């Protein structure tokens, strides 16, 4: 089984680019990160910052999680991120995604020791 920390890294980290290079970015990333294996994951965000900068958010602004839990943190700075969302043409096994790039504050839920991101709550 994949640990929570490793799943967060695989689903949400892309430190190899400064931002989504093209409209096909999400089709490529959702496939390469194995998020379209048995079903098309509908919505997914990739953060384009170093793994260290994203983990550091767990010691930044403590904000409530949409579920009411208290282990969410919002990044003090905006970070380059790409939101991937299925298009209406998507159906599987031929997943299709719209790529929307921006710079926003990220909110993550953290846990463990070390205290690292395990869920991506939203942008902002």
**Would you list which residues are annotated within the binding site for substrate?**
7, 10, 41-45, 66, 85
**What is the DSSP annotation of the chain?**
---HHHHHHHHHB-TT-SS--STTHHHHHHHHTT-SSSS--SEEEEE-S-HHHHHGGGGSEEE--TTS-S-EEE-SS-EEEEEEEE-TT--SSS--EEEEEEEE--EEEEETTTTEEEEEEE--
Under the binding rule (CB under 5 A), the answer on residue 51 touching Cl ion is no
The question of whether 48 is a catalytic residue gets the answer no
Under the binding rule (CB under 5 A), the answer on residue 97 touching Cl ion is no
Which position among 8, 12, 57, 123 bears the catalytic label?
Answer: 12
Q: Tell me which of 6, 51, 63, 124 binds Cl ion, using CB under 5 A.
A: 6
Under the binding rule (CB under 5 A), the answer on residue 74 touching Cl ion is no
**Active-site annotation, residues:** 12, 119
């Amino acid at each position: 089984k994949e640990t929570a920390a490793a799943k967060f890294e695989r689903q949400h980290m892309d430190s190899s680019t400064s931002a989504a290079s093209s409209s096909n970015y999400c089709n490529q990333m959702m496939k390469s990160r194995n998020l379209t294996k048995d079903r098309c994951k509908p919505v997914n965000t990739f953060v384009h910052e170093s793994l260290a900068d994203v983990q550091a958010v767990c010691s930044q602004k403590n904000v409530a999680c949409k579920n009411g839990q208290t282990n969410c943190y919002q990044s003090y700075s905006t970070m380059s991120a790409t939101d991937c969302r299925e298009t209406g043409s998507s159906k599987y096994p031929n997943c299709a995604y719209k790529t929307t790039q921006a710079n926003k504050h990220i909110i993550v839920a953290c846990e463990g020791n070390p205290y690292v991101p395990v869920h991506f709550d939203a942008s902002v």
